[PDB]
Amino acid sequence: SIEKIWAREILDSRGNPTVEVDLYTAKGLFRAAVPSGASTGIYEALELRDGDKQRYLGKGVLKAVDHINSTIAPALISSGLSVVEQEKLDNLMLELDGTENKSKFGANAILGVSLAVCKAGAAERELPLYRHIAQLAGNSDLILPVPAFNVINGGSHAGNKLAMQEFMILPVGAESFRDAMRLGAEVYHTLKGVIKDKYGKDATNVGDEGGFAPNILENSEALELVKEAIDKAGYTEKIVIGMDVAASEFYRDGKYDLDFKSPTDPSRYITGDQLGALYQDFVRDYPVVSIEDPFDQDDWAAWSKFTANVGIQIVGDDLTVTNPKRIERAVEEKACNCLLLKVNQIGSVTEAIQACKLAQENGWGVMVSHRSGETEDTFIADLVVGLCTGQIKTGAPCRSERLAKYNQLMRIEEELGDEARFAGHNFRNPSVL
Amino acid sequence: SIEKIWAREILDSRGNPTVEVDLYTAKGLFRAAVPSGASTGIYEALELRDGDKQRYLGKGVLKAVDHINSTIAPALISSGLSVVEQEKLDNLMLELDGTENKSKFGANAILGVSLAVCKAGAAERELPLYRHIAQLAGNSDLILPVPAFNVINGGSHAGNKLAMQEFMILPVGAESFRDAMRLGAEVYHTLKGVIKDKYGKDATNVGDEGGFAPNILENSEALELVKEAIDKAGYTEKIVIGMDVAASEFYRDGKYDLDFKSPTDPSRYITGDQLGALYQDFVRDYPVVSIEDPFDQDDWAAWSKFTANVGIQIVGDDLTVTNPKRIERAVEEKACNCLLLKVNQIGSVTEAIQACKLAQENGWGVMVSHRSGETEDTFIADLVVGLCTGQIKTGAPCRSERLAKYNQLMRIEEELGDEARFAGHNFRNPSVL
Ligand SMILES: O=C1[C@@H](P(=O)(O)O)C[C@H](O)N1O
Ligand SMILES: O=C1[C@@H](P(=O)(O)O)C[C@H](O)N1O
Ligand SMILES: [Mg+2]
Ligand SMILES: [Mg+2]
Numbered sequence: 001s002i003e004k005i006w007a008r009e010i011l012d013s014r015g016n017p018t019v020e021v022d023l024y025t026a027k028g029l030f031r032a033a034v035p036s037g038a039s040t041g042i043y044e045a046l047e048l049r050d051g052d053k054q055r056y057l058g059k060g061v062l063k064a065v066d067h068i069n070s071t072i073a074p075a076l077i078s079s080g081l082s083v084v085e086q087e088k089l090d091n092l093m094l095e096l097d098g099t100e101n102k103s104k105f106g107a108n109a110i111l112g113v114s115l116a117v118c119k120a121g122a123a124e125r126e127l128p129l130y131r132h133i134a135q136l137a138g139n140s141d142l143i144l145p146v147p148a149f150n151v152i153n154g155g156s157h158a159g160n161k162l163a164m165q166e167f168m169i170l171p172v173g174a175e176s177f178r179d180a181m182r183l184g185a186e187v188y189h190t191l192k193g194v195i196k197d198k199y200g201k202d203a204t205n206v207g208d209e210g211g212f213a214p215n216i217l218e219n220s221e222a223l224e225l226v227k228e229a230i231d232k233a234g235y236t237e238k239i240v241i242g243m244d245v246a247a248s249e250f251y252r253d254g255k256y257d258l259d260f261k262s263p264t265d266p267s268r269y270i271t272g273d274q275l276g277a278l279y280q281d282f283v284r285d286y287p288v289v290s291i292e293d294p295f296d297q298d299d300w301a302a303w304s305k306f307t308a309n310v311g312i313q314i315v316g317d318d319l320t321v322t323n324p325k326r327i328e329r330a331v332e333e334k335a336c337n338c339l340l341l342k343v344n345q346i347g348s349v350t351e352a353i354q355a356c357k358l359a360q361e362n363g364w365g366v367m368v369s370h371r372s373g374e375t376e377d378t379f380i381a382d383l384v385v386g387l388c389t390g391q392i393k394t395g396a397p398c399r400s401e402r403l404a405k406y407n408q409l410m411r412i413e414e415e416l417g418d419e420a421r422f423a424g425h426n427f428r429n430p431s432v433l
Numbered sequence: 434s435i436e437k438i439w440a441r442e443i444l445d446s447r448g449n450p451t452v453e454v455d456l457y458t459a460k461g462l463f464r465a466a467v468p469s470g471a472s473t474g475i476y477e478a479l480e481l482r483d484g485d486k487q488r489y490l491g492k493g494v495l496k497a498v499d500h501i502n503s504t505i506a507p508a509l510i511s512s513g514l515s516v517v518e519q520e521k522l523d524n525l526m527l528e529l530d531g532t533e534n535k536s537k538f539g540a541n542a543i544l545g546v547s548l549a550v551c552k553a554g555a556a557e558r559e560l561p562l563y564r565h566i567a568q569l570a571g572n573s574d575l576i577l578p579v580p581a582f583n584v585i586n587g588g589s590h591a592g593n594k595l596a597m598q599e600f601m602i603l604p605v606g607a608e609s610f611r612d613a614m615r616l617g618a619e620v621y622h623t624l625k626g627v628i629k630d631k632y633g634k635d636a637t638n639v640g641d642e643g644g645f646a647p648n649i650l651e652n653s654e655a656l657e658l659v660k661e662a663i664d665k666a667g668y669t670e671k672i673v674i675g676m677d678v679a680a681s682e683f684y685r686d687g688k689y690d691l692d693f694k695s696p697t698d699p700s701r702y703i704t705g706d707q708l709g710a711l712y713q714d715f716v717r718d719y720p721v722v723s724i725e726d727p728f729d730q731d732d733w734a735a736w737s738k739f740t741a742n743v744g745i746q747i748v749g750d751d752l753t754v755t756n757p758k759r760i761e762r763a764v765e766e767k768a769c770n771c772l773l774l775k776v777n778q779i780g781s782v783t784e785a786i787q788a789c790k791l792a793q794e795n796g797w798g799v800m801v802s803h804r805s806g807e808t809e810d811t812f813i814a815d816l817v818v819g820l821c822t823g824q825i826k827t828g829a830p831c832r833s834e835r836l837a838k839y840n841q842l843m844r845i846e847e848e849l850g851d852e853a854r855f856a857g858h859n860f861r862n863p864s865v866l
C-alpha cells in the first residue's frame with residue numbers, strides 16, 4: 001500500500017521549524033505538515049524539539065524527522081496495512097512509541113504521518129478528504145462551520161497590556177460559508193480603519209494570527225471596539241463575539257491577574273468568582289456567545305460553577321487538551337460544554353476523532369482550531385466539515401496560513417453544491433439541521 | 434486536452450478577493466491563484482476589480498472570474514490545443530482580449546488561466562513544474578536562488594514615517610538554499626529581539642510581508658538596525674543588504690519627498706541628484722549590494738546617471754513592469770541592470786518568460802518576486818528555478834504566503850539532490866555556473 005514515507009523540516013508561519021511528511025502510494029503523493037502552539041496547556045502531548053542552541057535557537061525538529069524516516073516509516077510499510085486503515089496505522093505508531101504523552105517520537109512526528117496517511121486513505125477510497133473523515137467518524141450529514149475570526153489580541157504574546165488573549169467575530173447570521181467570509185473580511189477591514197483613527201497609523205500591524213493588538217488595557221474596551229466595527233460595517237444582528245481568555249496564562253497563586261504584563265503586584269489579583277462576575281457583565285453588555293478557557297486549566301470548581309450559571313458556550317482548550325481522559329473528567333464535572341479540537345494537542349487523527357465523538361456524545365459543541373504557529377496545510381478545513389462540528393477558529397481573515405483554511409472551506413462548500421448546509425445560529429449544535 | 438476550466442474568488446494574504454483557477458485534464462486537477470500589488474506601477478497590466486461597493490468595498494473580482502468562466506474557458510477548450518502549448522494558449526488569450534493592457538478581461542483573469550495551463554502542461558510532459566518552465570525558456574541548468582528577505586518596512590503601506598519601502602537581507606554566503614533559510618530565519622528572530630529592546634514590546638507586529646515597521650524616520654537607521662541584527666546573529670561575513678526604495682511612491686513635483694507620510698511641505702523635497710548622493714553614502718557605509726526603484730518610474734535621466742556611477746545591482750520594478758517594451762527602453766538608456774520579474778505586472782507566463790530572456794540576453798540580472806498581496810500559491814518558486822535567475826524576493830521568513838515559496842524551494846533543492854547548485858555570491862550573474 002505504502003511505497004514511501006519521507007519527512008522533512010519546513011518553516012511554519014512564525015519562521016520556526018516544523019515537521020512535514022510526504023507519503024507515496026500508487027495514487028500519488030500525499031503531504032501534510034504539523035502546527036505548533038504558543039500558549040500551550042501543560043497537559044499537551046509532547047512537541048519534540050532538538051534543543052541545539054546553535055540551530056534555529058534550539059527549535060529544530062531534525063530528531064522528530066529522523067524518528068519518522070528511520071523508525072516509523074519502515075514499521076508502517078512493513079505492516080502491509082492499507083492507508084484506509086487509519087485506526088490500525090495510528091495504533092501501530094502509538095504502541096511503537098509506547099509512552100502516554102508520545103515523548104519517545106514526539107507528538108509532532110506521529111501526527112505528521114497520521115495526517116498524511118489520512119489524505120492517502122481518502123484517495124484510496126476515492127473520496128474527498130472531508131468525506132473520508134466523515135466515514136472514519138461515522139457521520140453522513142456534512143455541514144459548513146461558522147468561522148470565528150480572531151481580530152483583537154491580548155494575552156501572553158501581544159505587546160499590549162490587555163490580559164485576555166483573543167476577541168473573535170462569528171458571522172452566525174451569514175447566508176453561507178462564502179458569505180460568512182465576506183462578512184468577516186468587511187468587518188476586519190472596518191476594524192483596521194477604526195483602530196488607525198483612534199490609536200494611530202502605527203497601531204495596525206498584525207500578530208501571529210493576523211489580528212490587531214492596539215494598546216488598550218480594559219477588556220471591556222476590546223469588546224467595545226469589536227462591537228463598534230461590527231455596527232459600522234452594518235452587521236449588528238448577523239455577527240456576534242467569541243473570546244479566548246486563556247486564563248491559565250494569568251493564573252497566580254489561586255487568583256487571577258488581569259494586569260499580568262505590568263510589574264507584579266499581588267493586591268490587584270481577583271478571585272475566580274470575581275472573574276466569573278466580570279464575564280457575566282460582558283455577556284450582558286456585549287453579544288458574547290462563547291468563552292474559551294475562562295479559568296485556569298486546573299481550577300475545576302470555578303469552571304463547573306460558571307458553566308452551571310450561564311447559558312452561553314464554554315470552551316475547554318488548555319483544560320481538555322483534546323484528551324479523552326481530561327474530557328471525560330470535564331464531562332463528569334460539567335466543567336464546560338464545548339471542546340476545542342487541536343489535533344497536535346493529542347497527536348493522531350484517530351484520537352482527535354475519538355475526542356470529538358466523546359464531546360458530541362455528551363451534548364457538547366466542538367470547535368476545530370488552528371495553533372498560533374501554522375503552515376500552508378489545510379487539513380483542519382476538511383476535518384471540521386467531516387466531523388460536522390459547525391465551528392472553526394483558524395485566524396483573522398489575514399495571512400495565508402489562515403486564509404488557506406478559509407479558502408479551502410469555500411471550495412468545499414462549492415463542491416458540496418446544492419447539498420451544502422451552513423451551521424449559522426446552530427454552530428453549537430448543528431445536528432438539528 | 435483541456436476538459437474544463439473553472440475560476441472562483443478566494444481571499445489573498447491581505448484579506449482581499451483575488452482570482453483562483455482550476456484547470457482539468459486527463460491527468461487531473463491543476464490549480465493556480467493570482468497575486469495583487471499594493472504599490473503598483475502605473476504601467477502594469479490592468480488588475481480588474483468589480484467596483485461594487487455592496488461587496489468587499491468594491492474589491493471583488495467576480496467580473497474577472499466571469500470572463501474566465503464565460504469567455505476564456507470555452508475558447509481555450511474549443512481550440513483543441515494541448516496544455517503543453519503555453520505560447521499558443523497564451524497568445525490565444527491575448528488576441529481574445531485584444532487590448533494593450535489586458536483591460537477587457539483583466540490581467541488577473543488571463544494570468545490565472547495562464548498559470549494553471551503551465552502546471553497542467555508540466556504534468557502532460559511528466560515533468561516537475563520547474564523543468565517544464567526551464568524547457569519553455571530554453572534552459573538546461575537549474576540553480577537555487579539567493580532569497581532576499583524584507584525584514585524592515587517603510588513606504589506607502591507602513592505605519593511609520595520611514596519613506597523607503599523595503600530593507601532586505603540576502604544570505605549570499607550560505608552553503609545551500611536550506612542553509613540560506615536558516616540564516617534568514619535566525620537573523621529575523623534576532624532582529625525581533627533587537628527591535629523589542631530598543632523600540633518596545635508593542636513594536637514587533639508585522640506588516641503585509643512579515644517584516645517589522647518600527648517608528649524610525651532616518652533610512653540610515655534602518656540600515657544600522659539590519660546590520661546590527663546580522664552581526665549579533667554572527668553572520669556579518671555571509672549576509673548582505675538589498676533595498677527596494679519604491680521612489681515612485683514619494684515622487685512629488687519632479688522632486689522626492691523623504692517625509693511624504695507627514696503633511697505636505699515642498700521645502701522638504703530633494704532632487705534626484707541629492708537622492709543619488711544619499712544612495713552613494715548608503716553603498717559606502719553599509720553592505721548594500723542592490724537597490725530597487727531608486728528613482729521614479731518616469732525619471733529615466735536619474736536612473737541612467739546613477740547606474741553609470743555605481744557598481745551595485747540596480748533593479749527595475751515599477752520602471753520596467755515586467756514589460757518587454759519598457760525593458761528595451763531601459764536597456765537602451767542603461768537605466769538599470771536587473772529586472773524584477775512579476776508575472777501579474779504583464780499578465781501571462783509566456784510574456785514574463787520573454788521579459789526574463791530579453792533581460793538576460795542584455796546582460797541583466799533577474800529577481801523573481803512576490804506581490805504584497807499573495808496567496809498559498811507557490812508557482813514563482815518553480816519559476817525562479819526554471820528561469821535560473823539566481824535570486825528571489827518573496828517576503829520575510831514569516832507568514833505562510835511567504836514561507837510557502839521558501840518551503841517549496843527547499844523541496845526543489847532536495848529533489849534535485851546532488852545536482853543542486855546554490856547561486857550564492859553569483860546571484861547577479863548565475864549563468865557562469
Ligand atoms: O490558545 C490558543 C492559542 P495556541 O497557540 O493554540 O496555544 C492560539 C489558539 O487560537 N488558541 O486557542
Ligand atoms: O513594490 C513592491 C511591493 P508591491 O505590492 O509588489 O507593489 C512589494 C514587492 O516586494 N515590491 O517590489
Ligand atoms: Mg494556547
Ligand atoms: Mg485557546
Ligand SMILES: [Mg+2]
Pocket residue numbers: 470471472473474679751
Ligand atoms: Mg510596488
Ligand SMILES: [Mg+2]
Pocket residue numbers: 677679725726750751773
Ligand atoms: Mg518593488
